[PDB]
Each structure stands twice: as C-alpha cells, then as structure tokens.
Amino acid sequence: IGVPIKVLHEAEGHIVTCETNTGEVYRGKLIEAEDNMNCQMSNITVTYRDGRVAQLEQVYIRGSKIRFLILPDMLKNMLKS
Amino acid sequence: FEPLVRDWNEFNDINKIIIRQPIRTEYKIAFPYLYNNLPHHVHLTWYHTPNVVFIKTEDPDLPAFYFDPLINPISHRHSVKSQEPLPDDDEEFELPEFVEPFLKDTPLYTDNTANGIALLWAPRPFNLRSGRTRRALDIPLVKNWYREHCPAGQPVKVRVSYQKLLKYYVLNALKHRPPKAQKKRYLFRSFKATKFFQSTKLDWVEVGLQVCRQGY
Amino acid sequence: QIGELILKRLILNFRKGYRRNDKQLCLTASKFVAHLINQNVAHEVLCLEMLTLLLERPTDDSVEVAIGFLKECGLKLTQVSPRGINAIFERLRNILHESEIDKRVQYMIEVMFA
Amino acid sequence: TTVYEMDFLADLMDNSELIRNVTLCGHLHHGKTCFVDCLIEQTHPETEQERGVGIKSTPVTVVLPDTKGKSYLFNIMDTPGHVNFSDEVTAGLRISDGVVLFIDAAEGVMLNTERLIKHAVQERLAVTVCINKIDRLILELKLPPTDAYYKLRHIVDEVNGLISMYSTDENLILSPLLGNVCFSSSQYSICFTLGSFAKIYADTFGDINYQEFAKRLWGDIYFNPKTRKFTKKAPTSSSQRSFVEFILEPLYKILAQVVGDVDTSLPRTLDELGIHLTKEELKLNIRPLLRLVCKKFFGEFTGFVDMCVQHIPSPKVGAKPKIEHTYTGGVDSDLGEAMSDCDPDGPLMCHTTKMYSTDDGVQFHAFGRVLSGTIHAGQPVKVLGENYTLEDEEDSQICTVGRLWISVARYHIEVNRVPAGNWVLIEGVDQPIVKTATITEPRGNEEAQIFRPLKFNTTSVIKIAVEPVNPSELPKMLDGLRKVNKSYPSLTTKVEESGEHVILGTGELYLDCVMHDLRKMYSEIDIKVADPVVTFCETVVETSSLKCFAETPNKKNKITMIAEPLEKGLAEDIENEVVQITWNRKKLGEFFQTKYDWDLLAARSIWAFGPDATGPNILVDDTLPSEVDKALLGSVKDSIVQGFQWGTREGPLCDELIRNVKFKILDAVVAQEPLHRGGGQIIPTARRVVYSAFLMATPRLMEPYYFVEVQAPADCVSAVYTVLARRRGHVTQDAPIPGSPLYTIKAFIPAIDSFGFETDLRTHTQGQAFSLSVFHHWQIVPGDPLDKSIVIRPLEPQPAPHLAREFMIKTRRRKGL
Amino acid sequence: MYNGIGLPTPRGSGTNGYVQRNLSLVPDILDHERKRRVELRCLELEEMMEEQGYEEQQIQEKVATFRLMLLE
Amino acid sequence: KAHPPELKKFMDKKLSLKLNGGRHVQGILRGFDPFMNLVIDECVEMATSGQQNNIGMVVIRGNSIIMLEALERV
Numbered sequence A: 001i002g003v004p005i006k007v008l009h010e011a012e013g014h015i016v017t018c019e020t021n022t023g024e025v026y027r028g029k030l031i032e033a034e035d036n037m038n039c040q041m042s043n044i045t046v047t048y049r050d051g052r053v054a055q056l057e058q059v060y061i062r063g064s065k066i067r068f069l070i071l072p073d074m075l076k077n078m079l080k081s
Numbered sequence B: 001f002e003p004l005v006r007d008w009n010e011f012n013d014i015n016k017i018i019i020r021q022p023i024r025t026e027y028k029i030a031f032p033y034l035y036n037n038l039p040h041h042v043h044l045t046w047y048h049t050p051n052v053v054f055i056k057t058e059d060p061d062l063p064a065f066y067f068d069p070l071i072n073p074i075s076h077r078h079s080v081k082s083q084e085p086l087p088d089d090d091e092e093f094e095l096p097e098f099v100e101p102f103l104k105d106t107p108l109y110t111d112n113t114a115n116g117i118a119l120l121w122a123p124r125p126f127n128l129r130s131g132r133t134r135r136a137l138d139i140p141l142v143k144n145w146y147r148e149h150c151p152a153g154q155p156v157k158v159r160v161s162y163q164k165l166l167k168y169y170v171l172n173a174l175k176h177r178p179p180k181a182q183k184k185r186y187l188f189r190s191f192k193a194t195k196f197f198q199s200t201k202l203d204w205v206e207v208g209l210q211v212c213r214q215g216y
Numbered sequence C: 001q002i003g004e005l006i007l008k009r010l011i012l013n014f015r016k017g018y019r020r021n022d023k024q025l026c027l028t029a030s031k032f033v034a035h036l037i038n039q040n041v042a043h044e045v046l047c048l049e050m051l052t053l054l055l056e057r058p059t060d061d062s063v064e065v066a067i068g069f070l071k072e073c074g075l076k077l078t079q080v081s082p083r084g085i086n087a088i089f090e091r092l093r094n095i096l097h098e099s100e101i102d103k104r105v106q107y108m109i110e111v112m113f114a
Numbered sequence D: 001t002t003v004y005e006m007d008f009l010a011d012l013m014d015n016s017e018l019i020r021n022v023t024l025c026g027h028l029h030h031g032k033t034c035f036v037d038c039l040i041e042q043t044h045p046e047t048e049q050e051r052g053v054g055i056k057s058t059p060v061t062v063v064l065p066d067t068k069g070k071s072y073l074f075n076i077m078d079t080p081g082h083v084n085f086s087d088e089v090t091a092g093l094r095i096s097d098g099v100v101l102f103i104d105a106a107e108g109v110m111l112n113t114e115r116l117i118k119h120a121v122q123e124r125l126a127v128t129v130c131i132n133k134i135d136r137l138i139l140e141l142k143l144p145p146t147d148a149y150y151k152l153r154h155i156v157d158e159v160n161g162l163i164s165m166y167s168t169d170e171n172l173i174l175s176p177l178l179g180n181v182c183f184s185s186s187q188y189s190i191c192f193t194l195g196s197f198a199k200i201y202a203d204t205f206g207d208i209n210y211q212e213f214a215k216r217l218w219g220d221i222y223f224n225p226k227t228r229k230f231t232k233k234a235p236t237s238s239s240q241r242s243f244v245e246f247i248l249e250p251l252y253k254i255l256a257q258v259v260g261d262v263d264t265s266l267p268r269t270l271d272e273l274g275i276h277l278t279k280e281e282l283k284l285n286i287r288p289l290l291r292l293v294c295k296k297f298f299g300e301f302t303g304f305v306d307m308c309v310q311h312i313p314s315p316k317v318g319a320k321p322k323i324e325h326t327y328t329g330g331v332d333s334d335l336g337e338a339m340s341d342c343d344p345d346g347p348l349m350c351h352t353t354k355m356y357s358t359d360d361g362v363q364f365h366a367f368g369r370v371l372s373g374t375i376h377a378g379q380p381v382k383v384l385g386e387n388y389t390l391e392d393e394e395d396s397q398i399c400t401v402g403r404l405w406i407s408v409a410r411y412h413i414e415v416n417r418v419p420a421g422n423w424v425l426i427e428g429v430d431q432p433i434v435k436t437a438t439i440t441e442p443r444g445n446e447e448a449q450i451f452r453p454l455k456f457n458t459t460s461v462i463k464i465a466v467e468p469v470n471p472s473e474l475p476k477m478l479d480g481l482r483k484v485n486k487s488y489p490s491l492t493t494k495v496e497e498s499g500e501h502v503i504l505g506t507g508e509l510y511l512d513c514v515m516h517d518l519r520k521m522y523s524e525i526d527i528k529v530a531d532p533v534v535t536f537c538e539t540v541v542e543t544s545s546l547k548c549f550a551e552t553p554n555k556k557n558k559i560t561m562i563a564e565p566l567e568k569g570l571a572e573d574i575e576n577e578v579v580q581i582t583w584n585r586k587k588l589g590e591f592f593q594t595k596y597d598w599d600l601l602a603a604r605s606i607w608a609f610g611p612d613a614t615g616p617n618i619l620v621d622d623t624l625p626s627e628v629d630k631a632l633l634g635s636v637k638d639s640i641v642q643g644f645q646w647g648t649r650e651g652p653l654c655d656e657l658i659r660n661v662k663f664k665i666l667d668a669v670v671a672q673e674p675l676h677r678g679g680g681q682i683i684p685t686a687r688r689v690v691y692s693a694f695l696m697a698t699p700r701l702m703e704p705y706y707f708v709e710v711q712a713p714a715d716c717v718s719a720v721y722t723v724l725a726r727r728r729g730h731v732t733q734d735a736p737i738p739g740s741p742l743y744t745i746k747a748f749i750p751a752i753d754s755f756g757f758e759t760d761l762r763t764h765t766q767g768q769a770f771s772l773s774v775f776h777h778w779q780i781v782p783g784d785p786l787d788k789s790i791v792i793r794p795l796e797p798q799p800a801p802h803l804a805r806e807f808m809i810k811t812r813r814r815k816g817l
Numbered sequence E: 001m002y003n004g005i006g007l008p009t010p011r012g013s014g015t016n017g018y019v020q021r022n023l024s025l026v027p028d029i030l031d032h033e034r035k036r037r038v039e040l041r042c043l044e045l046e047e048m049m050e051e052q053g054y055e056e057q058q059i060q061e062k063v064a065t066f067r068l069m070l071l072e
Numbered sequence F: 001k002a003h004p005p006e007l008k009k010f011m012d013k014k015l016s017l018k019l020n021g022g023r024h025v026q027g028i029l030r031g032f033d034p035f036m037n038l039v040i041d042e043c044v045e046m047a048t049s050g051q052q053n054n055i056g057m058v059v060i061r062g063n064s065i066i067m068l069e070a071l072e073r074v
Ligand SMILES: Nc1nc2c(ncn2[C@@H]2O[C@H](COP(=O)(O)OP(=O)(O)OP(=O)(O)O)[C@@H](O)[C@H]2O)c(=O)[nH]1
Pocket: B049, B050, D027, D028, D029, D030, D031, D032, D033, D034, D035, D052, D053, D054, D055, D079, D080, D081, D082, D132, D133, D134, D135, D136, D184, D185, D186, D187, D188
C-alpha cells in the first residue's frame, strides 16, 4: 500500500477539492476514500469547465477518472519517508 | 522495635460508643489513617494482587495444555443460549487454496513446553534466562525461609529467632542510604603497580598457611 | 458365565429401552449396567459405548439417561480411565452449551458437574 | 519542592467527527491502567503507586490510527475499579459517550463488572467489551484451545444475559461478529477483534476479503479444507470450530514456541511469520521477548480503536439522546437544541465534573466537557452552581479563565482555545464551584439551565467524626474539609448541631484515603478521629391503633393523622423513579391499582412523597365528608406537605431519616379563613402529628446491610464461613467459578460488623481470600428501640434483644440529647 | 496482637514482657373508618354504575341510595 | 485486493451517472462487481438535446463511469 494513499485516507472527514479527467472541479467533505482512489463526498460545490457552479448533496467519483486532489494543509506536518 | 518518639477526649466517652467488634492492631496497620490518631512516618500498605492460578503437573507424560481435574468444570449453562448474526452459507464463500491455519506444520507442544511454563513462575534466579553474576557473599540462601508467616508448632526458641531475623531484615531495608559519594582508590592495583609486589597462583591452603604464619 | 448371561440380558434390555424409547426399561437396564461397571463385572469400553450412544444426539431423555448412569458409575470410569471423565465432561459441555437445550438438559448438566 | 502536531490536534478537535469520548471501566485489577500505559508508550516513545490500587480517575486524550490509517482523537477516562470508589466512575459516565468494560478472562464477571454494566445502561451510553488478560488461559491455567473457546463464549453470554436483564430493548447483543469485543493481553501487547485478525490474515497471506472472512470466525462455524467453504455443523472429522483452528490454536502455538522452545524452534517459527529479530533482541528474557514478538506480529492496537470507532456515538451524533438525562429541560426552545448542534458557536454550555488539585497550592483545575460553543483563554464566563434555579441568580458567580490545559496521563499541554466536544482542564473556575458546575457565557446571557447534579449508584453510609487536637486551628481544619469535599464526588461532609464535623463516606478504604489527603496535603493540623459508625433509619411495623392530633398554637386548625407501614416493592419503586408523581393523578392511579391493588381512592388521596422528591414515605388524605372542603384543604396542602417532609427528614427518634411508612389524614378541622395564623403556625402542627402517630404505635429502627463477594481457594471456604458467623453473616451462595480453581461466596453482613472484615478474612487465610463490599438494603435491627427496662452494660457487647435500644441511646447521646 | 496490652519495650523492666490472655475470663377510629367505608361506598357504587352507565343521573341514583340506604 | 467498490449505501437508490463522451444517464442501482460495472434499472438517456428517453434495465461498464451522484439521501 502506497504512502500517498495513507495520506489520502488521513484526509477522510476533511474538506477536499477534486479535479476529474474532464476538468470538472468538486469541492466538499471527503466521506470515504478507497485504495484505488474511489472517492465518496458530500455537500459539494462543482465548477464546470465553462466556469458555472452547482451544488450537490452526495457524490462518488471513480479513482481512475480523477486527475488530482487538493487536501488540507492540516495534514502536511509521514515525514519519515 | 523501640518506640519511635516515646488527658481527656470526647470521642472515647464510654457512653457514646457502640462496640460490636473490638478494634485490633491488625486493622490499625491495614488502614493507618482511618484507625489512628497521630499517624506519622507511616507507609500505607495495601494489595489485592490477582491470585495466580498455576497448576503444577505430576508427570511429564500428559500433554502440556490439558484440562486439569483441579480446575472446576466449565459446564457453562444459560438459557437457549443465543443465535448469531451468522452469515449462513449456501450463498457463497471460499478460501483461496493458499492460506491455511497460520502455522499447522508446528505441533502444539513438545517435551519442553510444560517445563518452560513452570519456569515462568519460579523464584527470582530461576525465572530468568540471563543476568549478571553475583558475588558469593551476596547470595543469602535462607532468607526466603524466615520470611514465612506461621511456623505452626515449633519451639518458642525458634519462633523468637524468626522474629529477630525479621527485625534485622527490616532495619536493613529501612536505613538504606544511596551511595551518595564515590572515591575509588584501588588498593591492590596501586600495590601491584609498584616494584615491591609480585603475583602468582597458589593453592588456597598454601596461602592460608602463609597468612597465618605472617600474622604470627 | 452366569453373570455374563446377566450382562447380555441387561445389554438387550438397555438397547431395547433405548431403541424403542422406553424410559423406564432403559433406565433400569442402565442401572444394572452401572452397578456392573462399579462391581467390576462390566468393562469400560462398553460403558463408554453406552454413554456415547446416549450422548450421540442428547435430548432431555437420553442425556438424562446418561446422567443417571453417571450418578452411580462416575467413580469406576473416572478412576480406572480418567479419559472417560474428560470425554464425558467435554462432550456434555459442547452438546449442552452449543445446541438448543433447555433448563431440563441445563440442570442435568449441572447435576453432572456437581 | 508538539510543534507541527498540536496544531493537527487542534484541527482534529475542530472536526468534531473524528473524536470519541470513552470511559475505561470494569472491575478491580482487570487491566485498565496497564492498557493505558502501554498505549501512551505506543503513541509517545517520549499514594497510588505504593497502593497498587488506583483511587481517582485520570483522563487521557491521544491520537490513534485505525485499520485504515485515519487518525482519531480519543478521550479515554481511566477509572478506578474498587467498588468503594464507584463515585469516580459516575463522573466519567456523565462526561463521556461510550464505555469500554474490561473483563477478566480468568475470573469473568464479578461484583463491579455487573454493577457497572447496570450503571452504564441506565445512563444510556454505548457498551463495548474487552476480554482482557487472555494469557492467563494459556500460560497460567493451561487450557486446551477448545476449552479456551468455551470459557470465552461463556463470559460473553453471561454479560449478554445481564445487559439484557437491566435493559428492555433488544437493540444490541454483544458478540465479536458485530465488533463489540476485543481480546487482549495488556502486558503482552496483543489486542485484536475478528476484524483486525482477519485483516492480518489477509495482509500477510493472499488477497482474501477480510470483511467476509471476519463474518465467519466466531461461533460454531466449522470449515472443511477440501471444499475451502465454511459450513455450519457438517464435519464428522471431529474437528474444531472456525474460531479455534483459525485464531486460538495459532495463538497457542505462538506462545508455546516462545516460552517453551526459544532456543531451537523459535527462529524457524519466526521466519514462518515474517518477523525478523536481532541476535540482541533474542537475548531477552521470556516476558520481554514474548511481548516483543507479539507486538511485532499483532501490530499496535488496531482491534480496540476499530471496535470503538465503529460503535461510538461520536459526540456530534452524540449529544441528542444524552440531554434527555443530563439537561433539566432537555430540549425546549433555546439551549437543548443548541447543544444538540454541538457547534463551536454561541451558547457555550459546559459541564464540569472533576477538580484535580495542583500539588503546590490550594487551587484546582476544573475538568469538564464543552458541549456547545468554544472556550478560550481569558474568556469571561459565568458559573451555574448546583442550587441555582433560573430565578435565584446569586448562586452564579462570575469569573474568567486563567489557562487552558489538555491532558495526557500526567502531562499538561497548555493551549489557547478548545471547541465543543472535547474535555478540558480549566484554570480559574475553582473558588466558586463544588462537586458540579455548569459553565455559561459571561456577560452574554440568553438564559441558562443546569444539568441535574451527579447521581451515584451507591449510598454513602459510613460515618466518621473529626476534630482538631487544639481548637485554635478549627478554621484551618475547616479549610481542609472544604477542599476534600471539592476533590471527592460523593464525600458528604456536615457540621452537626452538637458541634461536630461528621464525614460521610463509602467504605473503610475510602475514608482512609480521605483522611490521608486531609492530613497530608490540605491542612497540616493534627486531627483526632472517632471510630466509624453508620447512619440509621426509622420505620414502623404496624398501624397507629389510635391517633394524637395536633392543633395550632392559636387553636384554629386540628390535624388528625395516623401512620402505618408500606410494602417494600412500592417504596423501592419510589426510589427507582418508577412511580414518579411527575405524572398526573391518572397515571398514579393506574400504576397503584394495576400493580398492588391499591385503591383508586387511595390514589386520589395520595398527596406527596416526603423526605424529598425521592422519599420512601407517602402522605395520604382520606376523610370524605371534610374532603370536599377543597377551599380549605386545597389551601393548606402546601404547609401540610412541608410539615410532612420536614417531619420525615428530621427524624422522630435519633434525628435520622425515616423510610417505608405511610401516613393518613383522617380528620382535618380547618379554621374558616385559614389565614396567616394557620398558614404560619401549622407546619410544626403537621410534623407533630407525624411524630405523634409514629412514636405512638410502633417505633422501630433500621440499619444498612453490606453485600460481600469472597473469592477463595477451594479449601478455605470453611474459614470465611466462621468469620461471617462471628459478625452476624448469613452467607447466601457459594459456587464454583467455571474454568478456575476458585470458589465465589456471596453473603450479607451488617455494615456495623463490616469494620475490618476484609483484613480479618485475609489474615485468617494467608491472603488467599479477598472480599469487596457494597451497600445493598436496610433492615430491622432485632431490638426494641423504646424499652426503659433495658439497661446497657456500658462497654461489653450487647446481645441482640437490645441492639436497637443501645443503638439509639448512643447516637442520641452525641446528637439528640 | 499488641492490643493495647504490654510494655512499649521490655528493656529495662526486669521482665521478658511476655503477655498472655486471661484463661479464666468467662373513639373516632371506627367512625372515621365508617366514613372511609362510606367513601368507596359512593365512588365504587358510582363506578360500578359507571360500568353500566355514566349518565351521571343513573349513577347519582345508585350512589344516592347507596349513601342513604347504607347510612340507615 | 480484488476489492469491492463501497456502493452498498447506494443500492436501490436513484442516481445520476456521468459517462465518458459527455454522456449522462439516470436510474436505480441494482448491483455492481469489483470492476465497478453497474446494473441500472429504469434507466433514462439524457440526450444532449435535453430530451430524455427510457431504455429500461441496463449494464454500465465501470471502465467508462466518470462520476455518479445520488438523487436521493443515503
Ligand atoms: N497476566 C496478565 N496480567 C495483566 C495483564 N494486563 C494487566 N495485567 C495486570 O495488570 C495489573 C496492573 O494494574 P491494573 O490492574 O491494570 O490497574 P486496574 O486494572 O485499573 O485496577 P485498579 O487500578 O485498582 O482500578 C498487574 O497486576 C497485572 O496483574 C495481562 O495481559 N496478563
């Protein structure tokens, strides 16, 4: 199991930002993060490629189709590696 | 021991007590503060250390782990006991034919485990595996003997001896001073380093006779 | 030979009472067989077979039959071959703590342990 | 005489959905403090000790990773387990949300364990179990692995039966499949749930699904190798259950290899597990070696944190089913819901339950939970004391905050701010408060209530008089007493009108520690102390065959009332809050008639309950033709009940409480216009009616009893028998312990004769036996309290016919005159 | 058990300080209760009448007779 | 490993599915496997025109699943 993955699981319960492979940007609370990067989130704000926003209560995004995630800086303080 | 240092009160008004059981010194030492006026320089002792239940075996024949007649039969009984959140089969489940009981090539016991467990609750030197070596005078062989509680029918002679050995023991423990200081002259290394002392190996008895002749 | 014929007859009576669900006859024949095992005329393997056939599918009746047998022949089996005592206790604990047994078999097991 | 990590701690506090508040409870010596110690060393590689018994609790809050790595903040209230100190447990039980009950594998359930499951279910907490001290089945008791299974199953089923006994709703049955129980060995670094063990199985071996696996291990599932498919009963192989073959037998072999064959087979077996160990670390002795191997294989602590996280309320979910009980209104308009939000915002309603004195000075640190809002340094706040009702605000002293601390066992890490949902040690709120406090916002007032002060499971019944040696220092001693009344939850101190200071406590060891702190720390005066005696009660045995009726000073109102005895069931219901008259008379009536064939007219007649809200006596009103004088009786009921409760409290015989009695009004000649003459001078009239009936036609005395549970070897049973005979015992039960070489004895003993019974027992048997004691019930003392033909030889012990006589003559001599 | 018997130190006392235990040691009550008897005589009559009718007149009739016929 | 997606929470709920190709459908989750292939019942194609057409019960390959959004509360 990968070092970044452990740090992701650490962000469960925190507000995170996710960009997909298609560039839609989802911000909200990370409920569950699976080993393969599958992500369950809640109370989302989504910002599309045209700039428009929307609001969603509940989402789940497949790990493969995630480009990246932004996590809190609360985590930064795994320095062993 | 000799006493440490050397009118009217109301609580001992003999009309105002109820005496059902006489207070006695063993209570007065179990609970120093509740049962005692002026408790000073008193150490508060209490212990209910979980009674250890180790069953000495008779022979090396029977297996190590073995229900002993001495143990009380479980025979746990209750109502129609219960039923589980038991995920019944006939749906599916299967173990990939790699995994196994974590180590089944190993037997439960050997001709060394019953012994090895008996060694686990044994007096201080023997429950070990390794330590430093002590001097020969530093090893009291008989202390564990006089530290015992009810000699139960020995002449008053030996009971008084028991109590006086306990007294000496306690005074030792009580008056213990840390080393607090150190200068470490080495008499014999200082001697050997001079041009006047030589060294050898002798029979004990020989240097015994030498020391006595030289004393004379 | 005479006591042997008596043993064969008590074996017939015990297997009859048991196989035909006759509580009284099975109980009496088990009484004679336990008295034999204590008088040292009936072997330990046959008493083992009796206790095992009674505790094969223990109900109130068959477990209680084993319990009555044991209340008298628990000394012979446990002093000649404690293996019988250990097997009896373990099998009792399993069949009376892991199957749908009631206060009847519960208290029979309790009497056994007593 | 944690730089980049405390910030992380703060953000965890701020999440309020990554924290869990749990109380670590159980019986005596069953593993709590060692659990906590090995745990803080897992996180930090960075009186009591001589006692070997913990007396007062300690809180720890630490950050633990689970079986997925997500860190949590854990609030762990390590309690003492001596049945005499149950007070401390109650404290934790309020300010926490779940309970981890530690049970011993070798003993099972005993006194304090069952009593704590009772106290935990009646306060509606979460209940988890750790069956600890499992090596005592392998190394010590030497049990075939299947009988280890049998014993574990037995313990779980019995705790299940009891938790069902005290709680109606079959919402939860405990079994490790649900994630309710860890298996542990605090000192040998092993704690595991079926979840954690199956995940270990998966991670080291192939990719098997650990969840579905864990669903299959405990509880009579067998497994056939060929099919590789677990089954209910159908091996005739005479094989073991899934549990044995897959979890126990491997654990037996681990231990047996470590302690038996450390020299030969251990390197091989260690290879087969994946642990590598240095030459230097295989030169350890067997206990350190065993623990090191078990730590290296079993990982740190995942079983516990997993079980708890999975079944903790998480104060955010948390609060709502709690403020039913804690809060005096619960949820009405403003604060019930506000707290239920658990938002770090606004209201700032906190509950402070402890005060840990600083070694140096007199001051304390109040310790409490912040339900709503967020506390900061210097924050001006207003306390709400225990007597404060909304229309008596003098009780609220107004103050501020000096420092803020957060706790590991004995390390104080000072912070600036704390949000709702945590515990905190607040400096500055010491001087205003006593046992309980409710903190609210200073100068920002909306309006505030208090949570009902702590309720305790046991009644404090032992009595000790205190005086200084020279009265010159009576004030200093008084300082001292205040302080200890501060630090001990159920220590009740009162200065009795005969001029003394009586201290009222739980047991002999309790009072010993009280006086230890009294003489050691809080005041250095030399103090005399009387011998222990107990507090009594008054009751009757038959009805007042004739009545004395009291009439006003200004002879206006005539009050006729008699007395008679209740039955025990309904009086205990009065105590249990089962017949709470907070109902309407309708519910009262159905209750009474339905259950004990009480009269519906008896129900219409029942007015109130006496000594206080909870008083085992009853006041009844039965005179129909004057009954319709509701103009006058409906007027006078207030003074009537006041005089009733006064009379019940202040005692007729020896100034002590009465119980188990029913009084009846049979003629109320009320003054027409019962103005202020009546209203003022009728309360003593009422209580003299009470005394009149009571003393008139059957005084009797009542004294408490103690429940004693004695562990003992098989032989020394007779020994304890004899002891209990000397002290008026009545041993009830004596029973094997299943799977142990010990017998358990359960017996009663008059709390009078309970003094030194423990040490007497242990001395006579060379420490082998050991008893704990609890108050259980009162009872009739066999004497006639009121007989002048009974004279008392003033120092030898009385025989039974006169115990009550003596008992009064002594106590009044010091109090009643 | 040094139970408040003996010497602090048997030291300069001329004795060994050995202690032992002394082996040779051994009238409205009836009228108020009639109104109580009368009490349920109105309610329980009006109740048993309520069981067969709560018209408050048929029960007042059964209660009025039970009050007059009993007091007679 | 060979893990399941954690979707039991979403079982028998109405969902909005964003697929690759800018494709979007809506339907009730009836099941799944470790590859995140889905069974969706009462499925409706939301054509880029805005028009919606009922396609019934269908299989969506997890490969081409970008994102799902619940139209219910879980
Ligand atoms: N054999 C064995 N003993 C253990 C184990 N874990 C803890 N102990 C016991 O733990 C004791 C240490 O104090 P604790 O019993 O933990 O303290 P406690 O349980 O809170 O009891 P109190 O402090 O009086 O409430 C030692 O006496 C050991 O007997 C264990 O895993 N195996």
